Amino acid sequence: TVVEFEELRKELVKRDSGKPVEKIKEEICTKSPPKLIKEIICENKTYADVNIDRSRGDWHVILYLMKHGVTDPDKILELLPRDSKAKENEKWNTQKYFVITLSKAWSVVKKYLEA
DNA sequence: CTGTGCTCA
Ligand SMILES: Nc1ncnc2c1ncn2[C@@H]1O[C@H](COP(=O)(O)OP(=O)(O)OP(=O)(O)O)[C@@H](O)[C@H]1O
Ligand SMILES: Nc1ncnc2c1ncn2[C@@H]1O[C@H](COP(=O)(O)OP(=O)(O)OP(=O)(O)O)[C@@H](O)[C@H]1O
Numbered sequence: 001t002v003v004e005f006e007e008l009r010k011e012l013v014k015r016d017s018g019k020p021v022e023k024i025k026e027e028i029c030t031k032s033p034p035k036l037i038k039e040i041i042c043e044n045k046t047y048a049d050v051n052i053d054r055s056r057g058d059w060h061v062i063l064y065l066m067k068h069g070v071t072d073p074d075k076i077l078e079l080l081p082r083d084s085k086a087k088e089n090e091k092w093n094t095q096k097y098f099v100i101t102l103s104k105a106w107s108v109v110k111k112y113l114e115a
Numbered sequence: 116c117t118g119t120g121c122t123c124a
């Protein structure tokens with residue numbers, strides 16, 4: 001598991017914009033995107049705003065900030081909502097969820113921007 | 116594969 005994070009975090013950081021997380025919400029919240037994705041990125045709410053599934057709320061937000069070119073997982077973990085299953089995961093592990101979700105989300109974005 | 120998630124084949 002830890003080796004799967006190690007190979008992802010190397011490819012994600014080499015594709016990252018190199019900006020700290022404070023720039024992610026600062027550059028998105030000053031724009032005029034739909035209020036739904038804006039409410040999540042500006043950290044004002046989470047999946048509870050739209051009553052969406054906790055996994056889908058983290059899925060749509062991770063893909064969106066990847067369209068802005070941000071890719072580094074250290075920011076994915078920092079913005080990760082504390083109301084998610086990543087809070088306690090009594091039958092799970094937070095790193096298992098984080099490795100699976102970013103592996104899938106990154107695969108979908110990088111294949112969308114491939115050339 | 117794992118709890119499943121998209122947008123787009
Ligand atoms: N619409 C909802 N969105 C988010 N959480 C919900 C919702 N309805 C109930 N919950 C609560 O949050 C957890 C998820 O319930 P739900 O039945 O939505 O499961 P799920 O759709 O398989 O997973 P998740 O929505 O957590 O990705 C449960 O503890 C439940 O009590
Ligand atoms: N019979 C079961 N009843 C409940 N959960 C089960 C069962 N079998 C497997 N599970 C796993 O346990 C999970 C629910 O407990 P878990 O503590 O992991 O989540 P949570 O309590 O909703 O989130 P958090 O622990 O972050 O608050 C389910 O999503 C599922 O993956």
Ligand SMILES: [Mg+2]
Nearest residue numbers: 052053054055
């Ligand atoms: Mg749900």
Ligand SMILES: [Mg+2]
Nearest residue numbers: 088089090091
């Ligand atoms: Mg729990």
